[PDB]
Amino acid sequence: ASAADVVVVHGRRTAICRAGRGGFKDTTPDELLSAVMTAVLKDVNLRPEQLGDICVGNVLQPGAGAIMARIAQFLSDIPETVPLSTVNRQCSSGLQAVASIAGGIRNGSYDIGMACGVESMSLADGNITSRLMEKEKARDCLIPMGITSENVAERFGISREKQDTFALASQQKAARAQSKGCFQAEIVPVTTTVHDDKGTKRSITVTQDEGIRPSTTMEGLAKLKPAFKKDGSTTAGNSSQVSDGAAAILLARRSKAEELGLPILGVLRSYAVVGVPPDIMGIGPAYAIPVALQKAGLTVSDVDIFEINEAFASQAAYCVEKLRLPPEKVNPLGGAVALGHPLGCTGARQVITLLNELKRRGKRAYGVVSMCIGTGMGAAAVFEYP
Amino acid sequence: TENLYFQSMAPQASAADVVVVHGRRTAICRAGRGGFKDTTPDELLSAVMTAVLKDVNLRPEQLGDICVGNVLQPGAGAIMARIAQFLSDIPETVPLSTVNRQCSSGLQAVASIAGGIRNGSYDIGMACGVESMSLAPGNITSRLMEKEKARDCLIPMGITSENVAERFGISREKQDTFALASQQKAARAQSKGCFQAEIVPVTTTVHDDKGTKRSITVTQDEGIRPSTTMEGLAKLKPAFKKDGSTTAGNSSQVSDGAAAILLARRSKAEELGLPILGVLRSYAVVGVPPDIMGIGPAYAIPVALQKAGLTVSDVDIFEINEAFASQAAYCVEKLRLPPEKVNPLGGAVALGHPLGCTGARQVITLLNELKRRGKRAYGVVSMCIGTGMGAAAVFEYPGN
């Protein structure tokens, strides 16, 4: 517990909605990001100008959303004096934003800052060398992530039934968690418009994660067509749903949090990023997690919760088995198969879901957030709850 | 700052300092019509990544991370950058990400690798910047116009040049004088060989309009135009505004280029026997009004100096980016910098400004000049940033 430690003060997120057909299908990402930035500042009552920097994870906007994010800041009436940037490490971008704010604090650039992630996959739309095909690993960076799911399932022998069992459990856990109110602290309601019959915007308020489908049955999952490959085992049912969402997290040097009387929700203890074959990008967490634990000084047995991103059941299941994780410790409130996976948001989202569960349990504990990353990487972060 | 032992330029040399081991850049070419007009940015970035590793003979898999600054590619060029890594045969086990803080992205890449080292994530990494302005807004809310500062983020940077020229009273003559000096300094520096160490030749193809493909090798910055005269600059039409003072001549030229920088924890550099070209001492990022974004360095520099524990007098060279002569001139006068210390080899009006690259490029240009001089010294790299920011970094060159 050093004065120099980077602590997580507080975080909020939007509900996660299905892309194209859900409540945020007509809502621009700057609006999603503004709602969560605004909520985090208000919740801890931090003067906006106390922010040393804002870092936004984002994957699909031009330039990784730098203009869009800056516009959001101003939509939140956060003053121009507070700077902003964006980061893209694909599916990890949201957690990357956390690591980059942590890094700025440790560089002496500022004492406090905000790490966000956002993605509008509803509003989604490099210039690459002509000799791509001379270089197999360059070529492999264009493999659709859904095909890498199938590659992982075949190389490492993860059956359809394994995948579906995994997905039904993620759905079922998510349903109970939602009913018990586990997501109510973290979600901020967002009021927006959705377009109608005759062109008129009509108002709605989104308070709940749309992809949690308690009607999921094992019979129904087994019936689904493959989503990417003729004789494949990856389906819409055992994959993350394409989604819209935002999340914002306030981080501070411990001594600054104390100076200002801000709560400490968690402490960042380690962050590990490793590279794997893009081909089978899903194996990332299997290699990121051990390095993160080593750096934080821990073993698998010391961790209470692992939030491992469920891009696809194939890769998530493989990682749990390879690492010999106690299954009851993995995504106890469900993961992305149920919650959705708005690319740039998910990493920050996980941190909030993780720490709010550790908080409820109220015991000093360690938790991991980890995900696979397109183009062949894994990231993992270790956090300590007080 | 206020402790018993403080002395403004006292040496500090911890095992934890983040040091710059080495750096290389492409020559910078004019967008659309230059040598890199047909070269994709992955190729530009590959050439510099390859060069830096080879130059210091680092095993590529020793890299803990690669961070690439980029502004105009989709997703800030993450797919592109990763492809470039593999074009350099840097193995998959080395991870990569991209960053966008607009014009500062290349320096931001340096700060982000520095930060990863400070986080305990790795001991050594590569900070890069790249931009193909030859080849390259988003989904924004419907109520932009309800929020003036949001609206202001869509003001063309060329119009913010005019805004700064009018708000702060910087004449056309002031601007042209500045641009002639930048060109003249750049021509001499090129003739003396100042850029020879840092530039890595790139061999690429250009498509001729006869439908013919031809191999060429670019070894020199295309924008350095010794034929610039005062008379010629005074005759140019305004580039953005009817009665304006900003022109193609007193602005940075739209450009293509990449730069790569290897950074390490000092103790790791020493374990591996790697050279130390410089040491990163501070990094400051501040916000200013987007409509006069050019003033950024005037507010970023003082903060960076305070953090590094320095005053303007302690600095030997300021590399201040010359996006526009208006903005650059304002910043030199506001800060009362000795002019001989600002961009001694010329800046972007002459060298060009490939958005994501520049910040990295500046670092390399700065450190190579301090190295030539061979004295222990401090240097500053700073730039204004679209949508209303400034960044500044302090670097220490060892020696004497």
Curated annotation (Swiss-Prot), chain B:
UniProt-annotated catalytic positions: C103 (acyl-thioester intermediate), H353 (proton acceptor), C384 (proton acceptor)
Gene3D superfamilies per record: 3.40.47.10
Q: Which GO CC terms are listed, alphabetically?
A: cytosol; extracellular region; membrane; peroxisomal matrix; peroxisome; specific granule lumen
The pathway noted for it is: Lipid metabolism; peroxisomal fatty acid beta-oxidation
Q: Which Pfam families has this protein been placed in?
A: Thiolase_C, Thiolase_N
Its recorded reaction(s) are:
an acyl-CoA + acetyl-CoA = a 3-oxoacyl-CoA + CoA; 2 acetyl-CoA = acetoacetyl-CoA + CoA; tetradecanoyl-CoA + acetyl-CoA = 3-oxohexadecanoyl-CoA + CoA; hexanoyl-CoA + acetyl-CoA = 3-oxooctanoyl-CoA + CoA
According to the UniProt record, list the residues that bear Phosphothreonine. T39, T40
> EC?
2.3.1.16, 2.3.1.155, 2.3.1.9
Expression induction: Peroxisomal thiolase is markedly induced (at the level of transcription) by various hypolipidemic compounds in parallel with the other two enzymes of the peroxisomal beta-oxidation system.
List the InterPro entries.
Thiolase (IPR002155), Thiolase-like (IPR016039), Thiolase-like_sf_Thiolase (IPR050215), Thiolase_acyl_enz_int_AS (IPR020615), Thiolase_AS (IPR020610), Thiolase_C (IPR020617), Thiolase_CS (IPR020613), Thiolase_N (IPR020616)
Going by the entry's taxonomy, the superkingdom of the source organism is recorded as Eukaryota
Identify a single GO molecular function assigned to this protein: acetyl-CoA C-myristoyltransferase activity
Name the keywords, alphabetized. Answer: Acyltransferase, Fatty acid metabolism, Lipid metabolism, Peroxisome, Phosphoprotein, Transferase, Transit peptide
The places in or outside the cell where this protein is found are: Peroxisome
Subunit-level organization: Homodimer. Interacts (via PTS2-type peroxisomal targeting signal region) with PEX7; leading to its translocation into peroxisomes.
* Family annotation (PANTHER family): 3-KETOACYL-COA THIOLASE, PEROXISOMAL (PTHR43853:SF8)
Q: What family is reported?
A: Belongs to the thiolase-like superfamily. Thiolase family.
The written remark on domains in the entry is: The PTS2-type peroxisomal targeting signal, which mediates interaction with PEX7 and localization to peroxisomes, is cleaved following import into peroxisomes.
Q: What does this protein do, in the record's words?
A: Responsible for the thiolytic cleavage of straight chain 3-keto fatty acyl-CoAs (3-oxoacyl-CoAs). Plays an important role in fatty acid peroxisomal beta-oxidation. Catalyzes the cleavage of short, medium, long, and very long straight chain 3-oxoacyl-CoAs.
Q: What is this protein called?
A: 3-ketoacyl-CoA thiolase, peroxisomal
Organism for this UniProt entry = Homo sapiens (Human)
